[PDB]
Design a protein around this ligand. Structure first.
Ligand SMILES: [Ca+2]
Ligand SMILES: [Ca+2]
Ligand SMILES: [Ca+2]
Ligand SMILES: [Ca+2]
Ligand SMILES: [Ca+2]
Ligand SMILES: [Ca+2]
Ligand SMILES: [Ca+2]
Ligand SMILES: [Ca+2]
Ligand SMILES: [Cu+2]
Ligand SMILES: [Cu+2]
Ligand SMILES: [Cu+2]
Ligand SMILES: [Cu+2]
Ligand SMILES: [Cu+2]
Ligand SMILES: [Cu+2]
Ligand SMILES: [Cu+2]
Ligand SMILES: [Cu+2]
Ligand SMILES: [Cu+2]
Ligand SMILES: [Cu+2]
Ligand SMILES: [Cu+2]
Ligand SMILES: [Cu+2]
Ligand SMILES: [Cu+2]
Ligand SMILES: [Cu+2]
Ligand SMILES: [Cu+2]
Lengths: 172, 172, 172, 172, 172, 172
């Protein structure tokens, strides 16, 4: 056992390891989306930039969790980063919809992680999740909802003009 | 024979002369396209600027080849610069499509030039083509593909609004 | 007929198209001369620079004419740009002499163009030629005459020292 | 088939997809190593920083390959990013030794990729690998060899003082 | 065998060692030429400066090759640096002619080195030679050809005035 | 005989030519040492930098002697630059010891050169050696002695840690 370990339950350590992998997965989904919009038959450069930014943000989320694990005296156990469900994201609107779904899934996992911290009387972990994760998720979900809404109201995905103009005026 | 000539095959010298003319031709096609978009009944100023830029880029491509010829001790033999297949380029989308076709044709000629350099064991010429031409073509082809894609998805060439908005937001 | 076309005779439109091609031809002659002086067995770098500058100047002359055509509602009809009469320009003095001859030929064509504008009662075209072309030609012809004179008096083309020193002290 | 695709063999497209995954794997190995050195019972912060830098470098290597795929008109097919062979890297010297082995493995794959490009007469791909990958690998391998050598000569991994001083004076 | 050595043939290692010596030899020839022009009975200071610069350039060429040897895990085996064929270089024109001959000889050796790299399927070495050596040689050969040409046309070596003026206007 | 030659004995001219070669030899020994420390199985970068600096310093020493020869009206006769006694310098301490021996040998030759100048009543040469060479040698010998001493006292060459720390704290 670590010289630093204090009030850190085995279940919490395990849950943190699972959360690290999920953040790395989210980052990979975003990378997949990013590259999709750089295809010659898609060619929406600001969508590509947006999802590239989101990919690196999720990477930072993974970093903080790995830091938390080391600080608390837990042991990081990395797992395979699974590829995304799709190779072809269909459209700007579909990718945004898929991103929204992903972020709500990550949020659900974080809420379960928080409940575990509360149940194990780990207020440091509870606050770590609150401070660095919970509001970030809520903000991310709201932004993606905003994007989905505009794209829909503009006539996406049927209107390619809608996705082009959104790429230019919101994302660029 | 030149005091500088070394490992420079007669066939390579001839192929370089042919490539010079093709680069000058490409430059002329782009000039034709440029001026078309400045017509009072077309009036797409950023299309005009874009193709003007492409015209001068091809001119630089011709310059480097002429320099290569002199450096290697070959003799430049210039040929007539043929006018383009069209006077009237129809639309923004059509010009982009025609440009894409042109760039792929120039690329094919460069690949054949590279094979000749390899076959004649001329690694200087091989690398000259690799370094200054091959990736430039690949980048140019991809960009034109991107442009064609956006214009199509926006509703060009039927939608004049599409070509107007593309001129403003991508090319301007 | 153009929505902009006013007082613009079919003969003038045709003559402008012919003048565009001649300016492009002059530019090409200068390019040929430029590259000649970059040959390892010629090696007069400031001659090369001088004629390169002249090449791009003629290009600008072609640009203004193409602009005039579009502004007046004429239609640009481009033609093949013919290669120069020579591949080998012999010497600094010979190239200058050939350039002088070329500029006087271009000037003759411009004077005929001006007479046509006067005959067709087209004062806009008449002034366009006067303002942008006629004095430019007179200046160019005089400069080339000056250069020919100095080279001759210095002992060119027999004296290679003369051409070397002229390259350094006048053109450099 | 892509509007941009030219001279791009199905085997090359597949090999590029495999190389993308390998670069992502290398990045993940480095991340694993990075976090290991941040453990309270390891605590070599400059080792951690060094491998973190290497992780992001491999990420850039993956980015350029993904860009190449899109530019050439290939389709990116992402795969699971496999976790590293180890959770516990034992020591500074062992991690450096493992990194050296990894880089030589990546290099072998790049050399095979280059042979395939040569065999398929794809000089653009050949030069892309040469320009952006081959010398980068050679430099990386040499640096890791240098590091392994110093650590060994200093008395690692038996001497914890050696690894501490190396962390401070070479990596910091 | 080196911990870093990969895909590096014994013949390539040997050829690199031979090339290192040749670059050091070229540097020494240039040094000899440099000092010759500083003789009180020669006194062409800009010739001296020019060849001094060339001497140090060849030294850098030797440095990069030595670096390549270490990076690839080869062992540097230095050899005697042979003195030049002449003590007395006769004239500005003769030295330039001798330099031209030297550079073409070095170039021939580099081309043979490149063929060996290709034959041994060593694309890293092939590109190293292409990137850092082949175009540098072509540029150097062309420049020396240019210099020889001007000196000849000016009346060298019979005309001491020609060599004096060339020293002042081209080299100074 | 030179128009500038005055009070310059044939023996002095010969001795200066021999000294030039010895300075070039010393420079080459240092270059050999420099590259040795850049080996992947040695990897002492500041040793490499130190000896590289010493190599170029000896080159300057050779330059001043060549200048002296020309100024006095002597004729430079260059000789082959002999490779060093070793390819493998064993260690930091051994190289420093070998450098110390080399510098004392060069110093002995300079002292003999000075005696010859005194014997031939050549006070210009005597002072040239005094001013530019004698104290430089004494300083160089003392510095190398200092380095040898520290390395020995630190536990070199048996202690690789000693050579590593010396590389970092004295040479870096
Ligand atoms: Ca899977
Ligand atoms: Ca025709
Ligand atoms: Ca013709
Ligand atoms: Ca697995
Ligand atoms: Ca290459
Ligand atoms: Ca000899
Ligand atoms: Ca020997
Ligand atoms: Ca004194
Ligand atoms: Cu990224
Ligand atoms: Cu996240
Ligand atoms: Cu233009
Ligand atoms: Cu081009
Ligand atoms: Cu807008
Ligand atoms: Cu130009
Ligand atoms: Cu003109
Ligand atoms: Cu990171
Ligand atoms: Cu990589
Ligand atoms: Cu210290
Ligand atoms: Cu020097
Ligand atoms: Cu060289
Ligand atoms: Cu002068
Ligand atoms: Cu050096
Ligand atoms: Cu010395």
């Amino acid at each position: 056992t670590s010289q630093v370990r204090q009030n850190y339950h085995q279940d919490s350590e395990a849950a943190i390891n699972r959360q690290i992998n999920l953040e790395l997965y989210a980052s990979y989904v975003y990378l997949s989306m990013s590259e999709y919009f750089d295809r010659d038959d898609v060619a929406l450069k600001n969508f590509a930039k947006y999802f590239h930014h989101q990919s690196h943000e999720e990477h930072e989320h993974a970093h903080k969790l790995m830091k938390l694990q080391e600080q608390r005296g837990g042991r990081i156990f990395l797992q395979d980063i699974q590829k995304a469900d799709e190779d072809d994201w269909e459209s700007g609107l579909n990718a945004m919809e898929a991103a929204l779904h992903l972020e709500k899934n990550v949020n659900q996992s974080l809420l379960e992680l928080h409940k575990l911290a509360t149940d194990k009387n780990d207020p440091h972990l509870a606050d770590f999740i609150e401070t660095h994760y919970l509001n970030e998720q809520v903000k991310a979900i709201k932004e993606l909802g905003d994007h989905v809404t505009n794209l829909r109201k503009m006539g996406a995905p049927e209107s390619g003009l809608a996705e082009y103009l959104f790429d230019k005026h919101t994302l660029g």
